[PDB]
Design a protein around this ligand. Structure first.
Ligand SMILES: *[C@@H]1O[C@H](CO)[C@@H](O[C@@H]2O[C@H](CO)[C@@H](O[C@@H]3O[C@H](CO[C@H]4O[C@H](CO[C@H]5O[C@H](CO)[C@@H](O)[C@H](O)[C@@H]5O[C@H]5O[C@H](CO)[C@@H](O)[C@H](O)[C@@H]5O)[C@@H](O)[C@H](O[C@H]5O[C@H](CO)[C@@H](O)[C@H](O)[C@@H]5O)[C@@H]4O)[C@@H](O)[C@H](O[C@H]4O[C@H](CO)[C@@H](O)[C@H](O)[C@@H]4O[C@H]4O[C@H](CO)[C@@H](O)[C@H](O)[C@@H]4O)[C@@H]3O)[C@H](O)[C@H]2NC(C)=O)[C@H](O)[C@H]1NC(C)=O
Ligand SMILES: CCCCCCCC/C=C\CCCCCCCC(=O)OC[C@H](COP(=O)(O)OCC[N+](C)(C)C)OC(=O)CCCCCCC/C=C\CCCCCCCC
Ligand SMILES: CCCCCCCC/C=C\CCCCCCCC(=O)OC[C@H](COP(=O)(O)OCC[N+](C)(C)C)OC(=O)CCCCCCC/C=C\CCCCCCCC
Ligand SMILES: CCCCCCCC/C=C\CCCCCCCC(=O)OC[C@H](COP(=O)(O)OCC[N+](C)(C)C)OC(=O)CCCCCCC/C=C\CCCCCCCC
Ligand SMILES: CCCCCCCCCCCCCCCCCC(=O)OC[C@H](COP(=O)(O)OC[C@H](N)C(=O)O)OC(=O)CCCCCCCCCCCCCCCCC
Ligand SMILES: CCCCCCCCCCCCCCCCCC(=O)OC[C@H](COP(=O)(O)OC[C@H](N)C(=O)O)OC(=O)CCCCCCCCCCCCCCCCC
Ligand SMILES: COCC(CCO[C@H]1CC[C@@]2(C)C(=CC[C@H]3[C@@H]4C[C@@H]5O[C@]6(CC[C@@H](C)CO6)[C@@H](C)[C@@H]5[C@@]4(C)CC[C@@H]32)C1)COC
Ligand SMILES: CC(C)CCC[C@@H](C)[C@H]1CC[C@H]2[C@@H]3CC=C4C[C@@H](OC(=O)CCC(=O)O)CC[C@]4(C)[C@H]3CC[C@]12C
Ligand SMILES: CC(C)CCC[C@@H](C)[C@H]1CC[C@H]2[C@@H]3CC=C4C[C@@H](OC(=O)CCC(=O)O)CC[C@]4(C)[C@H]3CC[C@]12C
Ligand SMILES: CCCCCCCCCCCCCCCCCCOC[C@@H](O)COP(=O)(O)OCC[N+](C)(C)C
Ligand SMILES: CCCCCCCCCCCCCCCCCCOC[C@@H](O)COP(=O)(O)OCC[N+](C)(C)C
Ligand SMILES: *[C@@H]1O[C@H](CO)[C@@H](O)[C@H](O)[C@H]1NC(C)=O
Ligand SMILES: *[C@@H]1O[C@H](CO)[C@@H](O)[C@H](O)[C@H]1NC(C)=O
Lengths: 173, 1294
């Protein structure tokens, strides 16, 4: 009951966003205790800095003038077993244009067994003033128009050909 | 004629003189023979000359030693003339009295009574103290008859004497055993009681007419010679394939991979890693909570997976106590015999798919199509023609006897030359009116509708109405009967049919009115629904069903009796064999050490197990029996039972089918000569624009329409339309839950939908202008296409305008799954099958009416028996059911539910008889034998409404589920099959064609293959005319050479079964050397046939088959050895090495018994192809619906991480499993979940959908519709293949 999706790279300036970090276990029926940390490295800078840490259904935000008041938790709620570790930022500025690392630490509890798992997710976020439509939509639009029109002209041309032929045959006899 | 004479010594003197004269210097009349009635021409016995020593009455016995006795029942006995044992002279008055005893029907009656009471005593499990004497006299009785027979005749000494008939051997053996183990302390009871059952076989020798039935059964099974060989050959080759593919891929378990070396304890101590024990330790596995066997897995991409910290390896033992396995040829053969008879094959399907990958499903298709669908129908057809021949021969004997009766008639006719009557008629006056009969029928229908109105959660207001209605209807019916009984005669005119039945019903109703409701009333109120059958006089199909039911207890009664005796014998045999073992090893199979639900400790449970294996479920009980009583005895007994009982049931089915066919009618009564009073009752109720086309614009418009029609008819537009339909249908596959991962594909499909709908709109418009409005609207195909395109137009223009989140728009979005329902009118193969089904549909509707009204009676019976008794208190924390001591009823469970105790739940069984609607679903599950286990488990635990069930408190409720299977699942099938056969025969008669499911394009190829099948062979062979010298040419044409090559192929087959998963490396090396030797010998054979014969390598086709299998042999043998360099491909060598079994198909070379069967399969292949294409289309549509609906339900029961509805592949696999109607209950339970179980809101990471609950209505309708459609399609497939088999087998030419 989980699909590992990837967050969108392009983020519009001045409006909200959603950074996706989904890491679900290999078997759903299992139970585990999971907590996450986030590290952000702005472009130009070469060091990752912890920004937030979610654990025991609480969120800890480190001191960072570029992130206080403009980030909220938007992951799984109501349980300690976390598979959605996404965070929601309510105001995208040009500071939030870098590399995000989502470190998810999970402790799986089996019968007479406890397993420690660490997964690191990599997200690239680009901040642009205006949102650009993906090339796939443009290509699909142009192609659908092209096939529609070419099919229309082919159909009318064949109809005209058969019309002339049958009319000539009828007039002849 | 009229020859009677005592066997005086001068008769023996002349007999011996005649034989001496014959020796010194021929067929008995079958009508006379022995043991049958005497022909009428001989007259009657004079005075008291019965049991007198008459002489033989036929030729061929005048000189031989013979001596004839007759009885008052007029049967013929032929004993020997010589004194028995040379001591007892016939006239010394010892043998005369014994013979007089033996010819008396009272002796047979006494023997029958003692046999029945003996078997009744064998029914008892624990031998009571007052039983030994009962056995003793039994033995004393049995030897009695033997003594008489010993007095009657000698021991096989000379002529027709004792110990000649096999039944004489049988009872001689039974008395020998009885007196061997009577007073002798030697003999273990578990070994003598199982042999004591041989007294039950004496029923056939005692009951008249059973011997002929047994002989007929043996004669019917006699013809099963080549089909058995073909079945074993197909099973062997498929088992070899499975063993080579799935070798060891069933013990794959996930063990904890990170090894705690510092904490690797040992039983002896001193730590250590100790491999081959670390993998055999149970605790180092992964078992899904709530399950028993550890989870399987696979190393492939599409196989199963296990959580972090676990990893797959071949460890432990195979599932199902190690019996379900592919590691050995024997186990593979068992597992594939489990597939030919589709019993619990879904478990093996899921296990192999999980442990080897989802790409192996193709294999399970083949075994299903050939090996489980073709072999079974082959066997059924063979038995069918055997029974046809037997029935025909019986008819010939009957008409021959009736014809000789004409000669006898000719001979005899030639040789001949207080005001009671007033009130009687008054109460009669209201009888001979159609109105009273119509009112009675309406009353019965209304009574049925009233009885169908009761449910478990019923208010007092409802029950008062139901009770007063029942009272008034009972009063009306009893008044009708009471008035009938005075009109004709108070004690007479009540035996003319249907007047004893209604009397019995009304008397039961009045008896039920009294006695109050002390006990047993629940079943007592279940016998009135028989008034429904009073409609049979007006319903021809119900009357036919009544005739079918009455044929079993009637003319075809001996077969039913034989089946009952066989079932009883098998039950007592199993109970006496494994009765004690189930208690000694009770927790070899059930961890609680309490006896399981299906044991063999008492007669009732043994009979239930026998009936279950008759129904088709036998492996589950076989494993339990194996785990407690060994493998050999259990396998032998279960195989014997499942063979013999199935054969008897099949014979009874065929006999009832034949009796239901028009042979029953003999013009004894006029065809519906009587008149139905309803017509006269109705009669007496009634008594009291259009512009021309030959103008400037009209002509142009006419050419426009003609050119539109020409464009429609052009066979380049149709192919393009079919391609567009295929593309549009395939575009619906990319709508799984992983759609968020593939954004670009989603966008492309979304934009291509517009192109597709525009194309179809243009096609519809052009078709409108071409065909015309009347022609477009006077056929179903264009109407269906118009409906599809109109719903697409709605979903397009509405979405473009907005309201994409509207409930109506979202509910119309899932209706897009009908897009594949457009190739039906394009493909001729689908269309012919569809229109044949449509033309035949009235008969199935007419019979479905009868089936529904019949099943309604059983549903009401269940409702009045299991209403609200399926509830039970449950503790979710410990997932255990409370016993009767903890809680007793709903009130106690509610008290236990005080405070925050939400773990305690008053749960209800999802499938139950709470009302007629759910009773119908329960009956459907029971009839198909899928999911009935839980229903009968809960039924036998029920005690009373509103109280916790107790384990096996109503054990005798199982009978209710047995009778239904006998009546609702067996005779209804007979009716359906008979009407289908009659309708198809009439369709073939009116059509005039040869096949229904075949297009005109396939009929020419049909006839061409028919000509090919009867083609004769020619063998023109010239000399090589070269240095070959022809010696090898004569060598290859030698029968010894062919025998040698066939024996070598057989040896290769034999050595291909010795491979074992746990074999040592030395055995692998030896097998590799042997296979290499065989391969090099085969290459030498190919070289020998090479360069010595070439001009015949494009005609016969066998040589090119050998040439194409051999090259595959060399590549798979040595290239596979080479691929280890710079390539791995672990699973590919097995596929290549499967080619080694190609040489096994060369046994078909001389296979004239089964070569015709394979040719019949070829002949029927295309008619099966059309139906399979239709079935695949239906599967695709239902799979799209399942993806659209049940892609997010909870993973419970049959729904898991690998067999579910999110993806197209998983849905396809599940639907293919459901096609054979295998475990559809498991895939229906998760949908029936409720908000108390499934969370209404639930986070789904990666998708916007919330919650994991399903719609019970949608799921129920989906599964029921799929079951009905699949049943119809499979029935059509069976009919087609059986017709083709009959056509092939009914051909013979010089
Ligand atoms: C699907 O794919 C999966 C992908 O992985 C696949 O998983 C693989 O499965 C296969 C088999 O199915 C696995 O192969 C087996 O692995 C076992 C694990 O053994 C490991 O530990 C051994 C012991 O460790 C001691 O010695 C090491 C070296 O000396 C040290 O590194 C250890 O620290 C330790 O040292 C000492 O200290 C210990 C305590 O501190 C002390 O107890 C110990 O005694 C010792 O003094 C290692 O030897 C072994 O390493 C060997 O194998 C790895 C490859 O796995 C290579 O590095 C070398 O080959 C190395 O020698 C592992 O680290 C093995 O034990 C097992 O081998 C035994 O059994 C095979 C037959 O099954 C024998 O032929 C063989 O002799 C081995 O020895 C034992 O058995 C024999 C008799 O059988 C007995 O005579 C002997 O005394 C001994 O008891 C085998 O190799 C594989 O590991 C899995 N994963 C990997 C990594 O690939 C899966 O199977 C697939 N599933 C399916 C079916 O789909
Ligand atoms: C009318 C008459 C109809 C026919 C009646 C007779 C039918 C069949 C004959 C069966 C004879 C069996 C004789 C051998 C019995 C025996 O003792 O066999 C032992 C072997 C090996 O057992 P194992 O050690 O591997 O057990 C491991 C599992 N553990 C650990 C739990 C024990 O058993 C095996 O290989 C199992 C072999 C099973 C072969 C048959 C399977 C069914 C297929 C076809 C039946 C006919 C059609
Ligand atoms: C397996 C593992 C190894 C790989 C094998 C791959 C396939 C390679 C070879 C198999 C096909 C070989 C060629 C078959 C056609 C040859 C031929 O000559 O075609 C005509 C045959 C009919 O018999 P005939 O005239 O050959 O013999 C005399 C018949 N008499 C006595 C009635 C006059 O047509 C027929 O139905 C015969 C063919 C029936 C269908 C075979 C399907 C096999 C799959
Ligand atoms: C092998 C040869 C077989 C020959 C035929 C033998 C008989 C075959 C049929 C057997 C049984 C059929 C009837 C089953 C009735 C089950 C009733 C039941 O237990 O129902 C439970 C549900 C529960 O409530 P809910 O969740 O729905 O409440 C929703 C409330 N709200 C709307 C406010 C959200 O209540 C409902 O009414 C659920 C919906 C009930 C009706 C479902 C559809 C029944 C039949 C469909 C077949 C149609 C023809 C197919 C032809 C193919 C060719
Ligand atoms: O014409 C089509 C047919 C057959 O015509 P034919 O003259 O028999 O020619 C047969 C020849 N083999 C050929 O097809 O060469 O003949 C027909 O098919 C005759 C159909 C008669 C009934 C027509 C009913 C109405 C049709 C639809 C009219 C739609 C009008 C829409 C007006 C819209 C205005 C905005
Ligand atoms: C999965 C696929 C379906 C099941 C496949 C099962 C194994 C099939 C193995 C086929 C091997 C090659 C067969 C053809 C060999 C060459 C050949 O033509 O032989 C000659 C024979 C001739 O016809 P016939 O049936 O013997 O005639 C009987 C009389 N009438 O013709 C034949 O032998 C052909 C008929 C027999 C072979 C099987 C045909 C159906 C498949
Ligand atoms: C002159 O020849 C006339 C003849 C006409 C009839 O041909 C066949 C039509 C199908 C029919 C009626 C025939 C034989 C066995 C019949 C089967 C027995 C099996 O019993 C069942 C019941 C359930 C199980 C116990 C076993 O399977 C059914 C599924 C199976 C069955 C009822 C399906 C229908 C079959 C005859 C051929 O004409 C070309
Ligand atoms: C709102 C929606 C759901 C209405 C559509 C309902 C359809 C299922 C019905 C309505 C009209 C029916 C049609 C009405 C008339 C006919 C003609 C009938 O054939 C004839 O009468 C033969 C005429 C001739 O050839 O002379 C075949 C069925 C058919 C197409 C019917 C098929 C089923 C149809 C399309
Ligand atoms: C070819 C066959 C399938 C035709 C015969 C079908 C009927 C047996 C079905 C079709 C619709 C069903 C009804 C659909 C809905 C309901 C409402 C349902 O009311 C409830 O509240 C359900 C309670 C429950 O779940 O038990 C009671 C059953 C009933 C009347 C069903 C009774 C059985 C019906 C008539
Ligand atoms: C007559 C028709 C009979 C049925 C025909 C069925 C054809 C076959 C229809 O089902 C396709 C499967 O056989 C194979 O599916 P896969 O194993 O490739 O799916 C893998 C999916 N994951 C794991 C990668 C997501
Ligand atoms: C809403 C969703 C749930 C219900 C879906 C129901 C779908 C039903 C589909 C039925 C789809 C099948 O319907 C039957 C028609 O195809 C019969 O057509 P005819 O054969 O009568 O047409 C004439 C043929 N000749 C004579 C010209 C050759
Ligand atoms: C955020 O944005 C400002 C814009 O000038 C930039 O200097 C720096 O990256 C961040 N400063 C603060 C206030 O955090
Ligand atoms: C196993 O334990 C026994 C008893 O402690 C000991 O005698 C033996 O040597 C041990 N074997 C091993 C594997 O060390």
């Amino acid at each position: 009951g989980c699909v590992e999706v990837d967050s969108e790279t392009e983020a519009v300036y001045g409006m909200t966003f959603k950074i996706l970090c989904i890491s679900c276990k290999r078997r759903s029926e299992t139970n585990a205790e999971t907590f996450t940390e986030w590290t952000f490295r702005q472009k130009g800078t070469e060091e990752f800095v912890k920004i937030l840490r979610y654990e025991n259904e609480v969120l800890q935000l480190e001191e960072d003038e570029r992130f206080e008041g403009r980030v909220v938790w938007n992951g799984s709620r109501g349980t300690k077993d976390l598979q959605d570790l996404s965070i929601f930022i309510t105001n995208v500025t040009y500071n939030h244009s870098g590399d995000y690392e989502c470190h998810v630490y999970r402790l799986l509890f089996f019968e007479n067994y406890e397993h420690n798992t660490s997964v690191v997710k990599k997200i690239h976020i680009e901040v642009v003033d205006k949102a650009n439509r993906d090339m796939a939509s443009i290509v699909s639009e142009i192609m659908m128009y092209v096939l529609i029109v070419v099919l229309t002209i082919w159909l009318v041309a064949e109809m005209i050909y058969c019309y002339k032929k049958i009319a000539a045959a009828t007039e002849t006899a | 004629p009229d020859s009677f004479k005592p066997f005086t010594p001068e008769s023996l003197a002349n007999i011996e003189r005649r034989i001496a004269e014959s020796k010194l210097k021929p067929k008995p009349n079958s009508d006379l023979e022995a043991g049958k009635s005497l022909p009428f021409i001989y007259g009657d016995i004079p005075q008291g000359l019965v049991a007198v020593p008459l002489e033989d009455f036929d030729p061929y016995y005048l000189t031989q030693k013979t001596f004839v006795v007759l009885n008052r029942g007029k049967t013929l006995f032929r004993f020997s003339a010589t004194p028995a044992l040379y001591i007892l002279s016939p006239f010394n008055l010892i043998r005369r009295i014994a013979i007089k005893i033996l010819i008396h029907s009272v002796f047979s009656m006494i023997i029958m009574c003692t046999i029945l009471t003996n078997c009744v005593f064998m029914t008892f499990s624990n031998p009571p103290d007052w039983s030994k004497n009962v056995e003793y006299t039994f033995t004393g009785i049995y030897t009695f008859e033997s003594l008489v027979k010993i007095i009657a005749r000698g021991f096989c000494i000379d002529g027709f004497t004792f110990l000649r008939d096999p039944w004489n051997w049988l009872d001689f053996s039974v008395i020998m055993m009885a007196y061997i183990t009577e007073f002798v302390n030697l003999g273990n009871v578990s070994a003598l009681r199982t042999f004591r059952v041989l007294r039950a076989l004496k029923t056939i020798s005692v009951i008249p007419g059973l011997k002929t039935i047994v002989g007929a059964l043996i004669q019917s099974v006699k013809k099963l010679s080549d089909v058995m060989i073909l079945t074993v050959f197909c099973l062997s080759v498929f088992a070899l394939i499975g063993l080579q593919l799935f070798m060891g891929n069933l013990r794959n378990k996930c063990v904890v991979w990170p090894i705690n070396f510092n904490e690797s304890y040992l039983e002896n101590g001193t730590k250590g890693f100790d491999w081959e024990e670390y993998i055999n330790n149970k605790t180092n596995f992964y078992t899904v909570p709530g399950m028993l066997e550890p989870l399987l897995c696979g190393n492939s991409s599409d196989a199963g997976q296990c959580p972090e910290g676990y990893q797959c390896m071949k460890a432990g033992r195979n599932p199902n106590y190690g019996y379900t396995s592919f590691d050995t040829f024997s186990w593979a053969f068992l597992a594939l015999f489990r597939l030919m008879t589709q019993d619990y094959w879904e478990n093996l399907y899921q296990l192999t798919l999980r442990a080897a990958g989802k790409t192996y499903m193709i294999f399970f298709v083949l075994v299903i199509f050939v090996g489980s669908f073709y072999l079974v129908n082959l066997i059924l057809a063979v038995v069918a023609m055997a029974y046809e021949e037997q029935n025909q021969a019986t008819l010939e004997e009957a008409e021959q006897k009736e014809a000789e009766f004409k000669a006898m008639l000719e001979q005899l006719k030639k040789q001949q030359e207080p005001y009671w009557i007033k009130l009687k008629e008054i109460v009669n006056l209201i009888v001979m009116d159609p109105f009273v009969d119509l009112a009675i029928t309406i009353c019965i229908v209304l009574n049925t509708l009233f009885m169908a109105m009761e449910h478990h959660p019923m208010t007092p207001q409802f029950e008062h109405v139901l009770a007063v209605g029942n009272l008034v209807f009972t009063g009306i019916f009893t008044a009708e009967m009471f008035l009938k009984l005075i009109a004709m005669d108070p004690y007479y005119y009540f035996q003319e049919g249907w007047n004893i039945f209604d009397g019995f019903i009304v008397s039961l109703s009045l008896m039920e009115l009294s006695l109050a409701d002390v006990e047993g009333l629940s079943v007592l109120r279940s016998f009135r629904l028989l008034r429904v059958f009073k409609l049979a006089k007006s319903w021809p199909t119900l009357n036919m069903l009544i005739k079918i039911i009455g044929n079993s207890v009637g003319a075809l009664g001996n077969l039913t009796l034989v089946l009952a005796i066989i079932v009883f014998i098998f039950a007592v045999v199993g109970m006496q064999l494994f009765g004690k073992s189930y208690k000694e090893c009770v927790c070899k199979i059930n961890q609680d050490c309490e006896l399981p639900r299906w044991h063999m400790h008492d007669f009732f449970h043994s009979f239930l197990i026998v009936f279950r294996v008759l129904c088709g479920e036998w492996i589950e009980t076989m494993w339990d029996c194996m785990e407690v009583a060994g493998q050999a005895m259990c396998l032998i007994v279960f195989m014997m039972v499942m063979v013999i009982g199935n054969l008897v049931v099949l014979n009874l089915f065929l006999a009832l089918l034949l009796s239901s066919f028009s042979a029953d009618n003999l013009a004894a009564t006029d065809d519906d000569g009587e008149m139905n009073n309803l017509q006269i009752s109705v009669i007496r109720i009634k008594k009291g624009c259009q512009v021309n086309i030959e103008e400037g614009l009209g002509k142009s418009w006419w050419i426009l329409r003609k050119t539109c029609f020409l464009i429609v008819e052009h066979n380049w537009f149709e192919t393009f339309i079919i391609f567009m339909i295929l593309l549009s249908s395939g575009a619906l596959a990319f709508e799984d839950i992983y759609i968020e991962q593939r954004k670009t594909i989603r966008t492309i499909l979304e934009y291509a939908d517009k192109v597709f709908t525009y194309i179809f709109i243009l096609e519809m418009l052009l078709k409108w202008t071409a065909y015309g409005f009347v022609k477009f609207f006077t056929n179903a195909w264009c109407w269906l296409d118009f409906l599809i395109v109109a719903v697409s137009l709605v979903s397009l223009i509405a979405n473009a305008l907005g309201y994409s989140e509207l409930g109506a728009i979202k509910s119309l979005r899932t209706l897009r799954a009908l897009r594949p329902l457009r190739a039906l009118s394009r493909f001729e193969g689908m269309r012919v099958v569809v229109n044949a089904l449509v033309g035949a549909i009235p008969s199935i509707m007419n019979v479905l009416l009868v089936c529904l009204i019949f099943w309604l009676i059983f549903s009401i019976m269940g409702v009045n028996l299991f209403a609200g008794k399926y509830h039970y208190c449950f503790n979710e924390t410990s997932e255990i059911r409370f016993e009767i001591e903890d809680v007793n009823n709903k009130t106690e469970c509610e008290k236990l539910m005080e405070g925050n105790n939400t773990e305690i739940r008053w749960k209800n069984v999802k499938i139950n008889f709470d009302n007629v609607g759910a009773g119908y679903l329960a009956l459907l599950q029971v009839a198909t034998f899928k999911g009935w286990m839980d229903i009968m488990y809960a039924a036998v635990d029920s005690r009373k409404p509103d109280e916790q069930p107790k384990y096996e408190d109503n054990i005798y409720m199982y009978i209710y589920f047995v009778i239904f299977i006998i009546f609702g699942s067996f005779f209804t099938l007979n009716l359906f099959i008979g009407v289908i056969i009659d309708n198809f025969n009439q369709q073939k008669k009116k059509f005039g064609g040869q096949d229904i499911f075949m297009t005109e394009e396939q009929k020419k190829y049909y006839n061409a293959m028919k000509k090919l099948g009867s083609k004769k062979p020619q063998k023109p062979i010239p000399r090589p005319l070269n240095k070959i010298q022809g010696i090898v040419f004569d060598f290859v044409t030698q029968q010894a050479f062919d025998i040698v090559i066939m024996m070598l192929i057989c040896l290769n087959m034999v050595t291909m079964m010795v491979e074992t998963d746990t074999q040592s490396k030395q055995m692998e090396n030896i097998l590799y050397w042997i296979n290499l030797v065989f391969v090099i010998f085969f290459t030498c054979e190919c070289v020998l046939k090479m360069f010595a014969l070439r001009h015949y390598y494009f005609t016969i086709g066998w040589n090119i088959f050998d040439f194409v299998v051999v090259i595959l042999s060399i590549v798979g043998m040595f290239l596979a050895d080479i691929i280890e360099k710079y390539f791995v491909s672990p699973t590919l060598f097995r596929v290549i090495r499967l080619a080694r079994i190609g040489r096994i198909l060369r046994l078909i070379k001389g296979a004239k018994g089964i070569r015709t069967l394979l040719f019949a399969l070829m002949m029927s292949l295309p008619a099966l192809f059309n139906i399979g294409l239709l079935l695949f289309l239906v599967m695709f549509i239902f799979s799209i619906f399942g993806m659209s609906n049940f892609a997010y339900v909870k993973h419970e029961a049959g729904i898991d991480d690998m067999f579910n509805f999110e993806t197209f592949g998983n849905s396809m696999i599940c639907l293919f499993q459901i096609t054979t109607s295998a475990g559809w209950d498991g895939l229906l339970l998760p949908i029936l979940n409720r908000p108390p179980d499934c969370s209404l809101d639930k986070e789904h990471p990666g998708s916007g959908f919330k919650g994991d609950c399903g719609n019970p209505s949608v799921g129920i309708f989906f599964f029921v519709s799929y079951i009905i459609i699949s049943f119809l399609i499979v029935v059509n497939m069976y009919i087609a293949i059986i017709l083709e088999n009959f056509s092939v087998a009914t051909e013979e030419s010089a």
